[PDB]
Every structure is written in structure tokens, then in C-alpha cells.
Design a protein around this ligand. Sequence first.
Ligand SMILES: Cn1ccnc1-c1cccc(Oc2[nH+]c(Oc3cc(C(=N)N)ccc3O)c(F)c(N3CCC[C@@H](C(=O)O)C3)c2F)c1
Ligand SMILES: [Ca+2]
Length: 223
Amino acid sequence: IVGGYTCGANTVPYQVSLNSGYHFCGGSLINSQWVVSAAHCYKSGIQVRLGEDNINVVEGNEQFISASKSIVHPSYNSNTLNNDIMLIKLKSAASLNSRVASISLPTSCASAGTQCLISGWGNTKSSGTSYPDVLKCLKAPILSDSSCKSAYPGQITSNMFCAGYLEGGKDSCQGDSGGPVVCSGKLQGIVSWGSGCAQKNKPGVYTKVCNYVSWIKQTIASN
Ligand SMILES: Cn1ccnc1-c1cccc(Oc2[nH+]c(Oc3cc(C(=N)N)ccc3O)c(F)c(N3CCC[C@@H](C(=O)O)C3)c2F)c1
Ligand SMILES: [Ca+2]
């Protein structure tokens, strides 16, 4: 997150860190046994870390759980990033509490202008690399389809939405990928891609979760 603020320990209880001996992607806890992330974050040997604040220190409240299976959307296209969504099943259920909680799936898509909270342990710099220890937060609005398309001609599908600031300096970035975009208590987006980070006229692009509710439910039910 570029241009954000320190969230405060366990203030974003559904935030998960995907770990393979280092933090590589975010995710969201949607029930005691399932996490949603981005398909582009897929890899084998994933350990899900719940209840994290400082990802480099064991502070208490953490729960480390291996992934039993990772389900990449069957129509994910690595060239276009269309359908950039993945489901991860935990080997054992998370213990839900004050600090580790699920986030609800949307019932309807969010409109342009809706303010959302984006969070992660990704890069905090536009120019250069600087990874934080603690979780960073950013409040950002969903942009109109028209602005989004103007920014990334021919690259925006019906399964994507733009959120952020055209003036630059505030955005998600590498390392935040697969993490949550929460609007009015519902998971509306997944951090997917953008051209650089916090660059003028190049807002972040997010997987539009409301288009996958049925798919999520159906997939979980059969696994
Ligand atoms: C439209 N489309 C189809 C297939 N790929 C794409 C694109 C196009 C443009 C950017 C895309 O995503 C990308 N997003 C990034 O950064 C991100 C930016 C944002 C944001 N601004 N809100 C969110 C998540 C990100 O992962 C990259 F750093 C990146 N890299 C550039 C190449 C080197 C790579 C690294 O590992 O060293 C970093 C990249 F290709 C993905
Ligand atoms: Ca920790």
C-alpha cells in the first residue's frame, strides 16, 4: 500500500498473509475453512497466516495453517488477468475470535463512488521498494467504468473494476495482490494489478467479486 496508514493490530480481522517462507500475497477469510485470493498468487506449499499484524515477529494471536488445496478459477487467463480469483481450503478450521474473523460476500455489486478499505503488506513506495512489517490500510473509492476504461483502454473486462485516485500517490502495490477490497462490510474486490503503483491516471484494478458469488458458493459446497 502506497500513501496509506498503519491499520492498528488486528483491526482487519479477515486479512490473511500467504506465506512460503516469506509473505507473497494477501487473501481474505470468508469462513472458518476458506480464503479467497488472486489466481496469480497460486503456488504450491502455501501456509496461510491469520491474525497477523507484524509479519516478522510472533506477537500472539497468529494462527498458521497449511493450505489443503488451492482452486484457481478454471477460466483464469494469465495474459489478461481475467477471472483473477482463487479459493484456498485450510487443512484445519481457523479458530474464530475477536482477532480472526470472516468477511461476508456481497449480495450486490457496489456502485461508483463507494468508499472501500484496501489493506496489505505490499510495497509502500512508488519509486523504490520498501516492505512494511505491519499491516497498512488505504481508504479508496470505486471509480466509474468510464474512467477505468479511459485509463486502461482495451484491458478492462466485465470482471474488473478500478478503485483509487487519478491524482496518484495512493494505491495498492506488489505484495498486496490477492488481498481485500471491503466496502460497507462486504468483500467487493481482490487486489489484482495496475501499471506501476500510485502513478497518475493509472488506478489499481481489482477482481469484481460480486460476479463470482455463485461460483464461490458452488465450489465450496462441492469441496
Ligand atoms: C493487463 N494484463 C494482462 C496480463 N498482465 C497484465 C498486466 C499489465 C500491467 C501490469 C500488470 O501487473 C503488474 N502489477 C504490478 O503491481 C501491482 C499494482 C497494483 C496496483 N497499482 N494497484 C496492484 C497489484 C500489483 O501486483 C507489478 F509490480 C507488475 N510488475 C511488472 C513486471 C515485473 C514484476 C516483478 O515481479 O518484478 C512487477 C505487474 F506486471 C499486469
Ligand atoms: Ca506476527
